[PDB]
Every structure is written in structure tokens, then in C-alpha cells.
Paper text:
In the absence of PIP2 it is clear that GIRK2 can adopt a conformation in which the CTD is disengaged from the TMD and the TMD-CTD linker has to be extended to account for the separation between the TMD and CTD. Thus, in the absence of PIP2, the global conformation of GIRK2 appears much like the Kir2.2 channel in the absence of PIP2 (i.e. both channels adopt an extended conformation). Using X-ray crystallography, we had determined a structure of GIRK2 in the absence of PIP2 (CrystalApo) that did not adopt this extended conformation (Whorton and MacKinnon, 2011). The crystal lattice offers a possible explanation for conformational differences between CryoEMApo and CrystalApo. Because in the extended conformation the CTD and TMD are free to move with respect to each other without hindrance, these two structured regions may have been pushed together when the crystal was formed. We think that crystal contacts in the previous CrystalApo structure pushed the CTD and TMD into close proximity. Four classes (1-4) were similar to each other and showed a disengaged CTD (i.e. extended conformation) with an unresolved TMD-CTD linker. The sidechains of positively charged residues that coordinate PIP2 are disordered in the CryoEMApo structure. In the absence of PIP2, the inner helix gate of GIRK2 is most tightly constricted at position Phe192 in the inner helix, which lines the pore on the intracellular side of the selectivity filter.
Author numbering:
A (entry chain B), B (entry chain C), C (entry chain A), D (entry chain D): 55 to 66, 77 to 196, 204 to 381
The structure:
């Protein structure tokens, strides 16, 4: 596409996967499907019972002789759904005699019991799996901090709750042409976010600015304001944080195209102490303000520094 | 609050969230709620079942004249809750006929069956999730050790059962002022407790003093004894380890403020080995005993060594 | 063997183990064995009942007298499987009485009930455990990249969903000869695929070329194009990554024997770019087209470059 | 103790942990205890039913001339354990009267139902939790490898399964003495078994000799053969591996002592080729032989080599 990975976390005929994702449903949808399957099974078994009643429908409905046709289930009407409910739900009341010695399809009862236990097991499994928030800045910025040009992207958690001890990874994807003439459509170069020093794992208790220093080994070493607009480089940032309870790393992914990166601006502070509690403005959490950042190349700035040292 | 993370492990209208907290309950609380929901279901079902026979309940309670006004039940006005218990718990005794041929409403027993299965499934699921110790020094200290100024804090296991694969990470939170003049309220800079050499990952069999050397890279590089009181920088130290008995990872957080960071001290001995075993005293683990350590800063101590070189 | 680890992922009387793998069965096989075992348990219960009633199967069956050799149950000798189905499935219809005076032993019912509960409990857990792809290029290649010789192997995600957070680890197993004189049959030397730089934890949208630079530290540092056929060195590469949809860890072992690792070839581009249209074809993933890669030994080539520099 | 951690993996009043130990039982023990629990529940309820027989023992209990002393359950004798089995496991027949309209309390049925459901749920949960190989060389050896002194300890997996990512970590515990005169009784100093080079996650298809080179940073940098016995160094090695089929992490802990470390010893090849195919001999795993090595210290050896080369 134009943008490789979208800003939310997405990059840009099967009868088994539908069953797998059916367990991943809202509780109301799950209970609704759970009642519907049972109702269908009861209705089908009741229809089966009426088909077994074709043998004795009119011969001795109330004659009660020594042999009434071959009475099975002792029910005189098509409303034998009572017998079906009692057999499936294992609540046989005996008002309807389970069966006579007459050779009916007792195997129909064998099917109801196994099917019910199997349907019940499936429903229990579906109930078991079903019952058992990070934000990045809109515009990553470039600013001059502590004598070095740096690339800054802010990270936070919108909710008051924060998933502490997060880890950050940054990958710059852009096309590279090598010395031999090899063209790689999507070259991936990792960005230092403190991995060497162990600074990747950090606390986000407040919204904080993740900083990549531009240096000789950095992918941006020779990036300058002059050519940064044209270059199609794309930055993709993945954040993995283990939740406070039953912690598991959740991948919060964002992207920054050359348009989103801004030169000469830096994020505007989000923390201000009032009455011992630090006001956190999520409205200004993304907002960036102009700073006096040199427009020369980072390598050019280093060369100017060495010239000054002499 | 002025102190960011407290010493214990804490930093300083929803139907689903309360339901999630309810599954996380004591065993006694869980069995109590499990019996209470069933009792409510049985009582409600008894009342609703009583409503169906209201027309024939007084018409012929025991008269049964020529089997007329069939009640769709053989139950009497009082203690008809037995029919509710039989329907919900699937005992299905035939003393009271579940449903007479007279139709009335047979859908009441369908509702009871689905509700009972659903309530049973939810209770089983809540029961399934329910069934299925590190300590830090009160005061961190600084002393001269092995020719280098160092910062030490005790880390111990309260229970004799060991915690394997303990990893210790220390992050110092203080407000940095950049060269540009952009103020960072909560700048987090990592402290090297052995991450490079793999000394970070340690097996704690007894309380062991984790030590960070104050070198050029250390945030404390230029902290003299006079400076340590002045600065309000805070340490946050986290130990993540799994139990020896079971592979369950526990994360224990702790904090240290300038008030609890002492100078010219060293921890006392927790273990003295004699009589066939280590003599373990946790009385002295929190306690410290003073030492004579140069008041000059670590950078200043290296400067003093340079002066000795002259 | 000739090849240590095969190309797919494989390297080259117990009641508990077969039982453990039995839970890992196809859904159809599991439901089939479940219904079959339930039917078998029911068939056995019916047979034991005939033996229990064997003494009174005639004596009071023919007489139909009052409490005189009254049978254990009010059932006939033939079609007595109904009693077993009712007792085991907990239907308890009551046309046949559960136990009578002059019982002749009611112990069988206790055994049947415990066995039935145990069977259901055991086979619900099996149902629960049961209900609750990266391709490597066939031929690793050697190409001249960025002014240095490099060993590169293509990794492809067959699934349209992109694999995320993939870590690559490469180990060269060779018959190392020590200077001491010890001959190590299977000496494992790790290969640097970006571990220090952090490039191992790569993000693959499309099949990408994993590259190892042949430097002094590299195991194949002195390997030569003439000797590339001679050697018996084998490369084992393992990829552990998370799917975008799900965080599932997998292992994909591969082998690159002396013959499979070509010299002078570079991979075929998988991605087709059409005005922002990205197409990934796995038909061309394995193809390699030749380049005039320098055939001198990497160490020899570096030394020649050094001599040229002078 | 004399030895801190034993060679197998061990280092050297509660009503909650007993339940955990009971869930952690053999399958036979779990089914046995469950059947015993069911028998206890039924037997206790049956007595209680005989106690309910106190109010109406024989007034119309047998003869039944009138409804006087109409029984809660129509059971003539103390052997009313048929009623207990029927009520608790929900197979009520009705040959024995379920309830009457003259009872002294039918709360016992409610108690029986709740206890039975709770017992079944607990016994299903226990069954669910219940249903749902590394070895080291007996004595480590210090030998001359590739012209440099090294510490070698052989580790392998007995089962042929291809355990993956068998990361190995070595910690040397000794009573190190500081310049201050305060000696930590246990000082954990990390040993570089490949963590710096990324060689730690070794494969164990063939038993393989883990090698630690002795350099300036190595703990044994100054140790010598004749001086090895006097020292108190204790080496503890922990190996973590995963089985092929996404197996759970398995942690094996082993130890060594001063007299279990030997000089000029090389493990004999665990696998020796037979008939053109290498043969695995777990009998030869622990086997060692005396090899020709120099007896001087590693630091002293380095100084001697430097003197020879000036």
C-alpha cells in the first residue's frame, strides 16, 4: 500500500475457524446460541417420537387392551415434546412409561442421551474459554536535545491504569540499493531505543518520550531536513507490555511516514504538579510545539562540532 | 503524591469488572454465593410453577372429580416447591406428575432447564478459575567497596522455599533539564545492576546485597555526601522471579527515596555458617552498621586518585 | 545420519503416553470413541443386571405373586438393557423399580453410579483439552552485499496474515578439530544474524532475506568457493515468531548441507510493486538467479582488500 | 551445609497446601479418593434419613392402614440408603415416595443437592488440574582446549527428544572477601558460558561439553591445580530447555565442589561412530580420562606465555 502498517495496530470458506471464533463472542450471544441448540435438539427428538407414534396413533389411544398396537412412551398425542424434554434433560417423571417390552426403536433414546452429553460437553467447553489501551503520538518529532539531534515519539496509556514494565522496539523499513546493485524492496533496519544499555524496558506510569539518538550507527545518521521530505522511509514501533494481573505482552503497533515526522518541533509537557497530584492532560498529550532545532544534517552537525574543537 | 511508588508494590458502574473480581473470591465466599444463587432459583421457580395451577388449585385440590379440571400437576397449594426442586435438580420424582396431558404451559419447564444448565455452567466456570514473598531493605546504603564507591540494597526471600531465576532491574526517576531548556518531569535512566554481564539474572538462596557500582555511566557519578541529601531523586527496583516449587512468575516492586538512601553504611551479616547450617537472622536484614567511607563523590574520588597520581 | 536435521522440522507399550496422545485426537475420532465407550459401559451394566436377577428371573417373573421372590427390579429377562440405560444416564423412569424388598443385593447400582460419574468426569476433561507456518529457502545462497561477502537464506511466511516479532537463531554444527587433538563429532558454533545489533527480533510482512556477514568472528570466515563443496558443515536455523492474529510460538528447523549452500546466487524478489500494489508470490520464493559473486575466500578477499588499501 | 546445592536439583499446620498436594496425586489415587468421598456423602445422608425415621418409625410405616405417621419418604426400615442414592445422584424412581404433604422438614433434600453438586464440581476440578530428563557430568573437568585453559562440564538429555533452546547459566558461589574486611558468605559471580556471545541457547541432540574459557574476567583466573583443593569454590549450573512439541520449560539444577573439579581430564566422546554411523552411549557420558595439560595457573600461564613472547 502507500502506508505499510496502519496507525491502529494492523498491517496493510472454512468450517473449523468459524467454530473457533464462535467461542470468542459476547456473553449474550453465547447464552443465546447455547439455548437455541438445546431447543433444536429437543424439537428434533420430539418429532422423532411422533414418527414412532405412527405405529399406534389410532389403534388403542385409550383402549388399553393387553396390546395397544405396540404402544411406546405411552403418549396419545403429537404433543409428546414432554417425553423428549424429560429424556434429554434426564428428568424422566414416569407419568409417561419410559417404554413397553414392545420392540420399538429404543436406539432413539440411546441417541438422545449420547447427543445431549456431547452437545452439553461442547457448550461447557465454549462457556469455559469465553469466561476464562496504549497510545502513541500522532506526529513523531525531531528535536535537538543535550547537544544531539534526536527522534522522539511519545508513549502513554489513556486509562488511569498503566501496564508497567513495558518494552519498546523500533524498525525502520525502507528500500535499499546495495553496492553490487541489489534492490531490496523492503529493507528492515533496527533502530536503537536503548537496547544496548538495557533502556528498552521502561515504566510508563506517566506519558513519556521514547528517544532515539541519531549517531553514526543509527539509520538516520545522514538524514537532513533537506532530503527528509522526499525519502519514503517508514518507522514501525511495537510495544510489548505484561499486564499487571496475569501479565502477557500485548503488541501495540504504530507507524510514522515521512509526513508524520516533523523537524524543528518537540512534544509539549503533559505533567504539571498541583496539590501533590500531577495534572496529566491527554488533550495536549499529542500536541507539539516549535523549538529552535538546527536544520543541518546530524553528520553535518558532528562535523561542525569537530571543526569547533580543532 | 511526592513519593512516586510506595514501598509495598503499589504506584502512587462496570458489570464485567465486578463479575471478574467475583470469580477471584475466597473458597468460602465462592461456595456461599454458589448455594445462594441456587436457593434463589429454586424459590422463584416454585412461585412461578404455583401460578400455573391457580385456576385448578382451589377447584379440586384433592377432590379429583372424574379427572376434570386436570391441573397439569398433582401438587397441592402448600409446599409445591418440591416440584421446583425436582425440575431444576433433574431428580424428577413421579409422586407429582411433571405435566398432565392437559396442555396449560409446558414452557415453564424449558425455562427452568436452560436456566439451571446455564447457572450450573457459570458456577462451575467460576469454581474452575478460583481453584486453578520477596523483601527489600528498609534503607538502601552507599559505601566504598573493593576500591570503588558503590550503592547497595538487600534483596531477600521471606520463605525458605526458593525463588529461582530472580532478575533485578533498577530505574532512577529524577527531573532532567536538557541543554535546549525543555524540562522532563519524570526522566527514567537505567542503573547497571549487572545487565551486561548477566549478573542481573541471579538465584537468591538467602538475602544477597545487590550492588551497583557508581561509575562514569552511573546516574550517581557526581554525587558527594553533601549532594545526596539535596537531591530528591527516587529509585524504583523490581525483582521478577519464579518459584522453585512451581513455575509461576512473581514481580515484586519497591522504592527508595532520598530519606531512605543512607551514606557511609554497610549491611550487617544475615548468614553465619556453623552447627551444620547457615544461622539465618531477618532481624539484622533491615538493620545496618556504619562504616568509614570517603565523603567525596565517586567522580571526586577518581579525581582524588588522579591527584595521588599527580 | 548423512543429514543431521531434516528439512521439515525433525531431527534425525506405555499406557500413560498413548492415553496422553489419545486426548490429542481429531474431533470426529474423539466423539466416536466417546459414544462407543458410553455404549460399551451401558452394554456391561445390562448384562450384570441379568445375573443379579438370575435367581428370581423365573421364580416370581412367571408367578407375578405378592412379595414372593420379588425380583431386584420389576423387569423381564429380555430387553433388560432399558434398566441399565435408565440407571447409568440418571433418567430413573420408574416403570422398572430401582430396588425391591427381598433385594438379593443392591450393591451393583452403587458401582454403576460411581463408574458412570468417573467416566463422564474423565471424558469431559479430554474433550476440554482437545477443544481448548514458515518456509525456508531450499538453497541458502552466498552473495556480495554492501562491499562484503554474505551468507543469506530466505524466510517466508506462507500465511497471508503476517508473522510478527520473529527471532532467528543460526547454529553451525561441524566436526571441529581442536589444537589439543580432541575431535569433537558435533561442535556447535553460533552464527551472528544480528543478535548484538538487535536485528534478530525481526518483523516480516513478506518473505525476507536473513543475512549473515562473514567477518573474523564468523564460523565460515575462511570457507572458500573451491572448498564450499568439500566441507561437511551443516547449518540449523530456528525461527520463533508470533502471528499477527495470535501470539503463537513455533519452531522451524532447517538444514543447509554443503551442497545446498550455493556460491554465486541471490534470491528472487517475492514482492511485486504496481503503483502501490504489493503482491506476494510463494511460487518464486525458492528461485535464485546468479551473480558474479567473488569466488575468493572471505578471509582471503579481506586480506586482498587490505593489501590494496596499503 | 557442606554442599550448598545437591546434585539432583535440590538446594540444601497448613489447611490450604494439603488440598494442592491432594490435586497433585496419581490418577488411581484421585479416582480412589473421589469414590471414597461419594460413598461417605451417600452413607452420611442415609443415616440422616434413618434419623428422620425417628418421628414415624412404624405407626403406619409398614401396615399403612391410615395416613397417620405418613412418612417423609415411604421407607419401612433403617436400610433407606436406596433413597439416599436416588436423591443425591438424581435417579429418583418414585417406588420410594419422594415427599409427602405432612413432612417435618424437606430442607435435607436441598442440603443433599447442594453438597452433591459441590462434591461433583470439586472432584471434576481436581481431575481436570491433574490431567491438564537433563543430566550432568558427575564431576566437572578443567582441561587445555584449543591452546587455552578451559573449564568443561558435559551436559545432555537422556531422552532422544530434540529439546530446543537449552539455555545454560553458571553461577560460582564463594566466600569472597572485600578490601573493607566484610566478606559476603555467599558471593554469586557470573561465569561466561556464552551469554555475551549468544551461544547460551545450545541444542542437546548429542551430549555436548559446555566450555567456559578462563580469562582475566573469569572467576578462576588465578586458580591452579595444586591450589584447587584448598579453595571452597562451588559451581551451580542451571539449564532451561523446551521440548519439541511446544513443551513447557524444564529447569535442571546441578552443582560441583572443589574436589569434584579435576585437572587434565577430558570427557571421552559420548557418541563414537560405529560402522559409519556415530553411536550414542549414555553409559560413556560420565566417563573421563587423564590428558596431558600444564599444571600452572591460568593467570600464571598467561604471564609465562607473555614472557616467552615478550
Amino acid at each position: 500500500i502507500q502506508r505499510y502498517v496502519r496507525k491502529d495496530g494492523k498491517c496493510n470458506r472454512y468450517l473449523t475457524d468459524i467454530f473457533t471464533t464462535l467461542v470468542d463472542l459476547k456473553w449474550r450471544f453465547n447464552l443465546l446460541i447455547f439455548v437455541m441448540v438445546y431447543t433444536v435438539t429437543w424439537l428434533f427428538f420430539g418429532m422423532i417420537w411422533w414418527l414412532i407414534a405412527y405405529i399406534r396413533g389410532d389403534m388403542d389411544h385409550i383402549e388399553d387392551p393387553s396390546w395397544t398396537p405396540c404402544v411406546t412412551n405411552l403418549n396419545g398425542f403429537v404433543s409428546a415434546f414432554l417425553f423428549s424434554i424429560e429424556t434429554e434433560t434426564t428428568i424422566g417423571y414416569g407419568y409417561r412409561v419410559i417404554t413397553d417390552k414392545c420392540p420399538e426403536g429404543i436406539i432413539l433414546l440411546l441417541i438422545q442421551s449420547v447427543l445431549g452429553s456431547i452437545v452439553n460437553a461442547f457448550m461447557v467447553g465454549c462457556m469455559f474459554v469465553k469466561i476464562s489501551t496504549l497510545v502513541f503520538s500522532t506526529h513523531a518529532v525531531i528535536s535537538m536535545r543535550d547537544g544531539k539531534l534526536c527522534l522522539m515519539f511519545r508513549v502513554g496509556d489513556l486509562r488511569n491504569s498503566h501496564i508497567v514494565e513495558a518494552s519498546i522496539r523500533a524498525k525502520l523499513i525502507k528500500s535499499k540499493q546495495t553496492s553490487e546493485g541489489e534492490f531490496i524492496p523492503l529493507n528492515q533496519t533496527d533502530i536503537n531505543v536503548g537496547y544496548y544499555t538495557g533502556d528498552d524496558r521502561l515504566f510508563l506510569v506517566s506519558p513519556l518520550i521514547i528517544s532515539h539518538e541519531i549517531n553514526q550507527q543509527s539509520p538516520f545518521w545522514e538524514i537532513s531536513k533537506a532530503q527528509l521530505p522526499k525519502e519514503e522511509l517508514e518507522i514501525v514501533v511495537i510495544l510489548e507490555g505484561m499486564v499487571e494481573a496475569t501479565g502477557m505482552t500485548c503488541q501495540a503497533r504504530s507507524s510514522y511516514i515521512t509526513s508524520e515526522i516533523l523537524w524543528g518541533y518537540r512534544f509539549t509537557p503533559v505533567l504539571t504538579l498541583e496539590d501533590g497530584f500531577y495534572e496529566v492532560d491527554y488533550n495536549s498529550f499529542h500536541e507539539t510545539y516549535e523549538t529552535s532545532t538546527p536544520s543541518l544534517s546530524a553528520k553535518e552537525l558532528a562535523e561542525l562540532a569537530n571543526r569547533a574543537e580543532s
